Every structure is written in C-alpha cells, then in structure tokens.
C-alpha cells in the first residue's frame, strides 16, 4: 500500500514468495458480482493501474509475473466493470493483448480476456513476430506461435 517492498536479493534468490502469493490470490477468482465485487474491491486496492506502474519495491529472480492474473475479470463483465476493471486498463490491459509467461500469456489472454485489438498502432504485431522468432526455449513459439503473433499484430 505504501510499503510495497518487503524483499531483497531477488526475494532471496521469501519476499518473492510473498509477492507470488499475492499474485496467486489475485489469480484466485475475479471481478464480476458480489463475490466478484469483493474481488473487484481487492483489485481496486491493487489498482491494476498501480501494479502496472510498479516494480521498484524489490528485485525477484523469476518473480516478475506476480500480476499476470489480470484476465479473470471478464465474467459478468458489467459487474466486474462496476467493481472497477479500468483502474489498471492502461498498462495491464496493454500487456494482455499486446503482441498479436508474457510470451505465452498474450495468446491465451487475447483469446480469454475480453479486450480490443492491440502504422502507429502496430507494436504488438512486431512483438509477436519476435516471439515466433526465438529458439532458445523448448520449442516455445514455433511456426504456429509465429502465425499467432502475426494475427495479433493484424488485430
């Protein structure tokens, strides 16, 4: 809230685990109704916008994706919106459907999180092409992945 950095040394290479737990809690269930409204209230505290804005509280090892659960407030979407889904819809919305953890996250969140398509508007498509290009992983974005990235760029 005001003291968002209880971690050091990339969360012990501990703090990272706590951050991960918060992210997991956010993933839990989210956004829409009465229970969804309670989740939305938690989301309001998070300010999806605040979360997008911040990461200087600590330095984790593989804990950079403790806020990737921003694709569960699309059910009873009007209710989710009523709770507040637009409070982080500038950074967190731009990261969900951005290309067409974060490389694989755009293809499912573009097909799961109800957002718009994301010239001077084409960076997501360029990012998708780069994702398709990588070969250091265990076949992460093959030809199909590249095609998906191209589709995202076209969107």
From Swiss-Prot:
- Protein name per the record: Inositol 1,4,5-trisphosphate-gated calcium channel ITPR1
Q: Which organism is it from?
A: Rattus norvegicus
Task performed by this protein: Inositol 1,4,5-trisphosphate-gated calcium channel that, upon inositol 1,4,5-trisphosphate binding, mediates calcium release from the endoplasmic reticulum (ER). Undergoes conformational changes upon ligand binding, suggesting structural flexibility that allows the channel to switch from a closed state, capable of interacting with its ligands such as 1,4,5-trisphosphate and calcium, to an open state, capable of transferring calcium ions across the ER membrane. Cytoplasmic calcium released from the ER triggers apoptosis by the activation of CAMK2 complex.
Q: What is known of its domains?
A: The ITPR1 structure has a large solenoid CY assembly built around the central helical bundle made of the C-terminal domains from four ITPR1 subunits. The solenoid scaffold includes domains responsible for binding of ligands and regulatory proteins and is connected via an allosteric nexus at the cytosolic-membrane interface to the transmembrane channel assembly. Six transmembrane helices from each subunit form the central ion-conduction pore.
Which part of the entire sequence is included in the shown chain? 1347 to 1538 of 2750
Q: Where in the cell is it found?
A: Endoplasmic reticulum membrane; Cytoplasmic vesicle, Secretory vesicle membrane; Cytoplasm, Perinuclear region
Q: How does it assemble?
A: Homotetramer. Homodimer. Interacts with ERP44 in a pH-, redox state- and calcium-dependent manner which results in the inhibition the calcium channel activity. The strength of this interaction inversely correlates with calcium concentration. Part of cGMP kinase signaling complex at least composed of ACTA2/alpha-actin, CNN1/calponin H1, PLN/phospholamban, PRKG1 and ITPR1. Interacts with IRAG1. Interacts with CABP1 (via N-terminus). Interacts with TESPA1.
Superkingdom, natural source: Eukaryota
Q: How does it get modified post-translation?
A: Polyubiquitinated. Polyubiquitination targets ITPR1 for proteasomal degradation. Approximately 40% of the ITPR1-associated ubiquitin is monoubiquitin, and polyubiquitins are both 'Lys-48'- and 'Lys-63'-linked. Phosphorylation by cAMP kinase (PKA) enhances calcium release. Phosphorylation by PKA increases the interaction with inositol 1,4,5-trisphosphate and decreases the interaction with AHCYL1.
Of which family is this protein a member?
Belongs to the InsP3 receptor family.
């Amino acid at each position: 809230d005001r003291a968002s950095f209880q971690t050091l040394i990339q969360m012990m290479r501990l703090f990272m685990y706590h951050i991960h737990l918060v992210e997991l809690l956010a993933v839990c269930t989210e956004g829409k109704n009465v229970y969804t409204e309670i989740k939305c209230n938690s989301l309001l505290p998070l300010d999806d916008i605040v979360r997008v804005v911040t990461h200087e509280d600590c330095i984790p090892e593989v804990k950079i994706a403790y806020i990737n659960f921003l694709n569960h407030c699309y059910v009873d979407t009007e209710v989710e919106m009523k709770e507040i889904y637009t409070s982080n819809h500038m950074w967190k919305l731009f990261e969900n459907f951005l290309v067409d953890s974060v490389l694989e996250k755009y293809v499912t969140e573009i097909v799961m999180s109800i957002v718009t398509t994301f010239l001077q508007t084409r960076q997501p498509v360029f990012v998708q092409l780069l994702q398709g290009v990588f070969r250091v992983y265990h076949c992460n974005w093959l030809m199909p992945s590249q095609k998906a990235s191209v589709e995202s760029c076209i969107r």
